[PDB]
Amino acid sequence: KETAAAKFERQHMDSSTSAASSSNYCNQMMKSRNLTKDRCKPVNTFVHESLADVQAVCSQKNVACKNGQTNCYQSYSTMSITDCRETGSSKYPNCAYKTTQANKHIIVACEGNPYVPVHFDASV
Numbered sequence: 001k002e003t004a005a006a007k008f009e010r011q012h013m014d015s016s017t018s019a020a021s022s023s024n025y026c027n028q029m030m031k032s033r034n035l036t037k038d039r040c041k042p043v044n045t046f047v048h049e050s051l052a053d054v055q056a057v058c059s060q061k062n063v064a065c066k067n068g069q070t071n072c073y074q075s076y077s078t079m080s081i082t083d084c085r086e087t088g089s090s091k092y093p094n095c096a097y098k099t100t101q102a103n104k105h106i107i108v109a110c111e112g113n114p115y116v117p118v119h120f121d122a123s124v
C-alpha cells in the first residue's frame with residue numbers, strides 16, 4: 001500500500017549521490033526504482049537534495065501545473081537534478097535512457113495532509 005508521497009520519493013528522490021550520475025545512471029536508476037517494469041517511462045527526473053528540502057517546496061512559489069491544476073510549486077533555490085529521457089533505439093523490456101545532470105528550479109505538485117510532493121511537473 002504505497003502512498004502517493006512514497007511513490008514520489010521512489011520515482012524522484014535520490015539524495016545519495018550529491019550528483020555524480022554516470023552516463024549509465026538513468027539506465028540503472030530507472031530500472032532499480034521499478035520505472036521500466038510495465039513499460040518504458042518516457043521521461044523522469046531525479047532530485048539530489050535532501051527530502052526535507054524537496055518537501056519544503058510545497059510552501060514555496062505557487063504556479064500553475066502543466067495540466068491546468070493549481071497545486072504546483074516552484075523552488076526558490078536551484079536544485080541538483082538528473083533528467084532521464086528514453087533513447088530512440090530503446091526497446092522494452094530493454095529500456096535505454098540518456099542521462100543529463102542539471103541545476104534548476106523544480107516544479108512539483110503537492111497534495112494531502114501533510115501537504116507533500118506527489119508529482120514532478122517540470123524543471124526550469
Ligand SMILES: Nc1ncnc2c1ncn2[C@@H]1O[C@H](COP(=O)(O)O)[C@@H](O)[C@H]1OP(=O)(O)O
Binds near residue numbers: 008011119120121
Ligand atoms: N493522477 C495524476 N494527476 C496529476 N498528475 C499526474 C497524475 N499521474 C501522473 N501525473 C503527472 O503527470 C505527468 C505525466 O505522467 P504520466 O507519464 O504517468 O502520464 C507527470 O508529471 C506525472 O508526474 P509523476 O510521474 O511524478 O507522477
